[PDB]
Design a protein around this ligand. Structure first.
Ligand SMILES: Cc1ccc(O)c(C)c1-n1c(N)c(C(N)=O)c2nc3cc(Br)ccc3nc21
Length: 276
């Protein structure tokens, strides 16, 4: 039986409990599969209730134990803490059935990773600035409530109409308070190695995210190149095309010291990052 999942109607017309098919198969029409992996499968679906378009992600295998169930269900809780924000993916409803967790969110466009692969070059700075502003707005929303995304990267930023984008994938989100999972080392803030976790980590990740898409550069997983991006100076070989304004903003975001690194509110207050 399907049960609703929320951390705040735990018990549908298109779904008959007498029928043996699952709630997902009975109340949704799978138009296409947006992605699949160890996390499970993501489908572009049309709801048989209101007809609007949504995206539903389901886990791959049933819950192994209580720890696995609580680990997967924690994403729903983190998504609720974010709340409704124009630059954050909105969660409609979440439910479990047969040890499988389903998350239904609004349908967004392609991820920033897919867009940059298709463009096959450095993104135009006009597109970069808008994506930097929208993600900073999302980060400022999370940071104001004491939340750290910890996985800001092109794959977790989804494009929208008119050059807008939304932040997604809150599985690694933690609430700073008086349980951290491993993140992508290519976008890892330098202080995370020493266990210093704070909202400043997201700003550094977005800095490397923008640096990657604005220069079409592959971020290193480790080594000397990993250090060079974290010593306070930018690599001149790929940052030549960057404008003086964008380069200065990246230097602010890539400050190795968390105490000195600028905040999302401070960056958004700058005139270059104000909505034109
Ligand atoms: C389904 C879902 C649940 C929770 C959550 O936080 C997010 C961001 C989503 N979610 C979307 N709302 C996507 C979209 N296009 O609207 C979307 N596309 C994906 C593509 C790949 Br490949 C892998 C995972 C994806 N997860 C997605």
């Amino acid at each position: 039986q399907p049960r609703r999942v929320s951390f705040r109607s735990e018990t549908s017309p298109g779904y008959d409990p007498s029928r043996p098919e699952s709630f997902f198969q009975q109340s949704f029409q799978r138009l296409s599969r947006l992605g699949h992996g160890s996390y499970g499968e993501v489908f572009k679906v049309r709801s048989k209730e209101d007809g609007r378009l949504y995206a539903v992600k389901r886990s791959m295998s049933p819950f192994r134990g209580p720890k696995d169930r609580a680990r997967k269900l924690a994403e729903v809780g983190s998504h609720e803490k974010v709340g409704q924000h124009p630059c954050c993916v909105r969660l409609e409803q979440a439910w479990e059935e047969g040890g499988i967790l389903y998350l239904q969110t609004e349908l967004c466009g392609p991820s920033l990773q897919q867009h940059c692969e298709a463009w096959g070059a450095s993104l135009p700075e006009a597109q970069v600035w808008g994506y930097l502003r929208d993600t900073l707005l999302a980060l400022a929303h999370l940071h104001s409530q004491g939340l750290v995304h910890l996985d800001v990267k092109p794959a977790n930023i989804f494009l929208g109409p008119r050059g807008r984008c939304k932040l997604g994938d809150f599985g690694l989100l933690v609430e700073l308070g008086t349980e951290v999972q491993e993140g992508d080392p290519r976008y890892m803030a330098p202080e995370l190695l020493q266990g210093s976790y704070g909202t400043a980590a997201d700003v550094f990740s977005l800095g490397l995210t923008i640096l990657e898409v604005a220069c079409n550069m592959e971020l290193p997983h480790g080594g000397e190149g990993w250090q060079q991006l974290r010593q306070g100076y930018l690599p001149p070989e790929f940052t030549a095309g960057l404008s003086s304004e964008l380069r200065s903003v990246l230097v602010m975001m890539l400050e190795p010291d968390p105490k000195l690194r600028a905040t999302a509110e401070a960056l958004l207050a700058l005139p270059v990052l104000r909505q034109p």
